[PDB]
Amino acid sequence: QKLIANQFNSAIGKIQDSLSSTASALGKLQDVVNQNAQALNTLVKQLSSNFGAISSVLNDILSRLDPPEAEVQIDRLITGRLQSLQTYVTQQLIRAAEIRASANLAATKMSECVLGQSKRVDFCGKGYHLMSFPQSAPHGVVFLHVTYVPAQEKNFTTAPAICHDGKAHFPREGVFVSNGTHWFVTQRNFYEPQIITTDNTFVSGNCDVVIGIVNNTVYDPLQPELDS
Amino acid sequence: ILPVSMTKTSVDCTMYICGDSTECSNLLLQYGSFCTQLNRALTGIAVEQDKNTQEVFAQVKQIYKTPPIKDFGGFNFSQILPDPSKPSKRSFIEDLLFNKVTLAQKFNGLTVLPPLLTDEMIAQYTSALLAGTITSGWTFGAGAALQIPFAMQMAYRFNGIGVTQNVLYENQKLIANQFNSAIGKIQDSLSSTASALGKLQDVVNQNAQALNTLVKQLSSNFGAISSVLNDILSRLDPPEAEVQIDRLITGRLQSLQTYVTQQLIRAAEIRASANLAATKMSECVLGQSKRVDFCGKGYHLMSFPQSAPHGVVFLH
Amino acid sequence: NVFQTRAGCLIGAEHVNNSYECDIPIGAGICASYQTSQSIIAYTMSLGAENSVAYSNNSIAIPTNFTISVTTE
Ligand SMILES: *[C@@H]1O[C@H](CO)[C@@H](O[C@@H]2O[C@H](CO)[C@@H](O)[C@H](O)[C@H]2NC(C)=O)[C@H](O)[C@H]1NC(C)=O
Ligand SMILES: *[C@@H]1O[C@H](CO)[C@@H](O[C@@H]2O[C@H](CO)[C@@H](O)[C@H](O)[C@H]2NC(C)=O)[C@H](O)[C@H]1NC(C)=O
Ligand SMILES: *[C@@H]1O[C@H](CO)[C@@H](O[C@@H]2O[C@H](CO)[C@@H](O)[C@H](O)[C@H]2NC(C)=O)[C@H](O)[C@H]1NC(C)=O
Ligand SMILES: *[C@@H]1O[C@H](CO)[C@@H](O[C@@H]2O[C@H](CO)[C@@H](O)[C@H](O)[C@H]2NC(C)=O)[C@H](O)[C@H]1NC(C)=O
Ligand SMILES: *[C@@H]1O[C@H](CO)[C@@H](O)[C@H](O)[C@H]1NC(C)=O
Ligand SMILES: *[C@@H]1O[C@H](CO)[C@@H](O)[C@H](O)[C@H]1NC(C)=O
Ligand SMILES: *[C@@H]1O[C@H](CO)[C@@H](O)[C@H](O)[C@H]1NC(C)=O
């Protein structure tokens, strides 16, 4: 317990320092703001364009030209500005669709990784998922996935099954491993050797069919008790 | 089969509308900043296209490789593993997929850019993923790869789908033969039939049709005397020549607008498909899935990725 | 200095027979980066470090320790 608590505290401190030092981690949130600002700036700047008319301001045109062709110039400006606004609105629609598509995924992640534990591989962070903590952000959300990662490996010599009295014994939950001389049964995600006995193994027929079977003694927790 | 990326295209604005005409460019400058929005949108599309492949395939920290001795408990993976004899390190089924797809020529200001990753890199990525899946199971998706005999891995999967491992260990030859026969059957089906890859051919056909229509739009009078800028300039008095040129400029600009909008929508659809492909690669391949009908009909055991032109192919 | 690639041609950068991670993408598998000399180099990107698990029909690798990690998304 103490080692895991210390590791979690150190990880939290490390991510806090990483956020405090580097400023390029929030590119996803900054891109939306920059794109919207550029779109609005372009739409505003599109006003000062002749579009084929004499001047870019209709007040000057009205104060200098008589109606019959001043209206033609105004109509040209109307067409240009209307089509520019059309383009801006279409771009906004597409971007909003993309943002909604991202928000749905954010909602799904909040529902699954936070409110429960997820078995979907590589969905709530690399490694085996344990929990998550949500954090708010300007026009966004930030998750802190907590994951479990195996660290230090070893080498052993497995076996699909084991013969004891001509029968075949398979592991109930785990694998058979050998440290060179003896045989053990251990869970598949953490080395914890145990003696092979009739509580970890279940019998299934004779043992002349399995390929790779190697026989060794299997302990029985009842005979020594019955001896007394 | 599902697509992952589209053609990396880009079209110049000034050259398309006013190709080699100073007067046309001078007239176009009056319209403001309409020659940069299209370029920005196409640049964004190109970057998105690169990112789609980069995120779908590049999911391995290292590049694993299978041991020289192919002793996999009776299973036969020679039809999907890389073939060193071929000049390109691509498998038999990858070659079949490459030969089943057929079909820059225009030069009116349109260019195509090569993808960031060559097909050899994609083949190497899929080879690394497949070798990791064969040798280490799903342990290479979490941390470092851990070796494990293939029969024991299959027993683990059988236990995963709620079937006791003694079912597999006492029938191993039967499953081996069935898997080999299935691989042979799918190879024969790919070799014989030709309409299986429609989901990849239709994207290319749509892009080609869009580009062809955009090019063919050049020959529209749009209400002017002629569709040639030089012909109008060399025949008409400039004060009305510019008036005539305005119609052509407007028509070509709006055609470019329409093409860019269509490209944006198609790119969004392709991005959605690429995200789905990335999710499938992360779940079905790097692990075992309990989601019904996600990794194929029936109870899922494992999957193998295979590359394809502008797409990926799974063998559930 | 003139260099020719499949995505056009690059001038001002020198060719290198090595391979590193991609820093500034160019195209067709060519990535450019700033060495250290203090020059600009254009190489061919490397996907990753070569590895080969010691697979065998009676060999296993079981972890004996773990580590807790926190990832920000
Ligand atoms: C494999 O594990 C067994 C069980 O722990 C080891 O057998 C014991 O070894 C210790 C010394 O390491 C002795 O003090 C014990 O008396 C041994 N047990 C018995 C029942 O005699 C064995 O040595 C290990 N093998 C290797 C190569 O480390
Ligand atoms: C399991 O133990 C038995 C002994 O009971 C071994 O069987 C012997 O195998 C040899 C060679 O195959 C024969 O010459 C003997 O006649 C067998 N003995 C009996 C009683 O049948 C068997 O080899 C052991 N398992 C393994 C994998 O070695
Ligand atoms: C795996 O299957 C392939 C089939 O593609 C086998 O390759 C064939 O092997 C037979 C011998 O049984 C030869 O007659 C054929 O010419 C081979 N075909 C090709 C295309 O080379 C391969 O032998 C099988 N694996 C093993 C270990 O036998
Ligand atoms: C498992 O790994 C942890 C660290 O990942 C080990 O804990 C360290 O042990 C050393 C002792 O040599 C201490 O100096 C460190 O301070 C410990 N780290 C932490 C974070 O507490 C642990 O010892 C390993 N397990 C075994 C059995 O060795
Ligand atoms: C297991 O042995 C192989 C070769 O015998 C070696 O390459 C590998 O590193 C060993 N495993 C560990 C965890 O050291
Ligand atoms: C494992 O492979 C070796 C050859 O490297 C072979 O001699 C041995 O019989 C194999 N083991 C089994 C259980 O098939
Ligand atoms: C190293 O690069 C040079 C060009 O910079 C090239 O001529 C030479 O062939 C390369 N070396 C090898 C072994 O290919």
JSON list of C-alpha atoms in Angstrom, two decimals, chain B residues 1-2 14 51 67 70-72 84-85 95 97 111 138 150 152 166-168 183 189 220 224 238 240 245 299:
[
{"chain": "B", "resi": 1, "resn": "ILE", "atom": "CA", "xyz": [-11.90, -3.19, -45.40]},
{"chain": "B", "resi": 2, "resn": "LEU", "atom": "CA", "xyz": [-12.22, 0.48, -44.50]},
{"chain": "B", "resi": 14, "resn": "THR", "atom": "CA", "xyz": [-4.24, 32.79, -59.08]},
{"chain": "B", "resi": 51, "resn": "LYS", "atom": "CA", "xyz": [-2.22, 12.78, -39.17]},
{"chain": "B", "resi": 67, "resn": "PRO", "atom": "CA", "xyz": [12.20, -15.34, -34.70]},
{"chain": "B", "resi": 70, "resn": "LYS", "atom": "CA", "xyz": [8.42, -20.69, -37.26]},
{"chain": "B", "resi": 71, "resn": "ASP", "atom": "CA", "xyz": [7.29, -23.11, -34.54]},
{"chain": "B", "resi": 72, "resn": "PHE", "atom": "CA", "xyz": [3.84, -21.79, -33.62]},
{"chain": "B", "resi": 84, "resn": "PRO", "atom": "CA", "xyz": [12.11, -11.00, -47.91]},
{"chain": "B", "resi": 85, "resn": "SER", "atom": "CA", "xyz": [12.32, -12.32, -51.48]},
{"chain": "B", "resi": 95, "resn": "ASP", "atom": "CA", "xyz": [0.59, -7.86, -52.73]},
{"chain": "B", "resi": 97, "resn": "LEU", "atom": "CA", "xyz": [-4.52, -6.13, -52.31]},
{"chain": "B", "resi": 111, "resn": "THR", "atom": "CA", "xyz": [-0.52, 19.73, -57.70]},
{"chain": "B", "resi": 138, "resn": "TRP", "atom": "CA", "xyz": [-1.60, -8.50, -25.86]},
{"chain": "B", "resi": 150, "resn": "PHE", "atom": "CA", "xyz": [1.27, -19.62, -28.96]},
{"chain": "B", "resi": 152, "resn": "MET", "atom": "CA", "xyz": [-0.86, -21.00, -24.19]},
{"chain": "B", "resi": 166, "resn": "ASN", "atom": "CA", "xyz": [-8.78, -28.19, -21.89]},
{"chain": "B", "resi": 167, "resn": "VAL", "atom": "CA", "xyz": [-11.09, -27.80, -24.89]},
{"chain": "B", "resi": 168, "resn": "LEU", "atom": "CA", "xyz": [-8.24, -26.24, -26.87]},
{"chain": "B", "resi": 183, "resn": "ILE", "atom": "CA", "xyz": [-6.45, -18.47, -44.45]},
{"chain": "B", "resi": 189, "resn": "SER", "atom": "CA", "xyz": [-11.48, -15.31, -52.38]},
{"chain": "B", "resi": 220, "resn": "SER", "atom": "CA", "xyz": [-17.54, 27.66, -69.87]},
{"chain": "B", "resi": 224, "resn": "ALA", "atom": "CA", "xyz": [-18.89, 36.27, -72.10]},
{"chain": "B", "resi": 238, "resn": "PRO", "atom": "CA", "xyz": [-9.95, 47.21, -72.56]},
{"chain": "B", "resi": 240, "resn": "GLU", "atom": "CA", "xyz": [-15.24, 46.57, -71.95]},
{"chain": "B", "resi": 245, "resn": "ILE", "atom": "CA", "xyz": [-13.36, 39.28, -67.87]},
{"chain": "B", "resi": 299, "resn": "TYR", "atom": "CA", "xyz": [-17.04, -14.60, -30.36]}
]
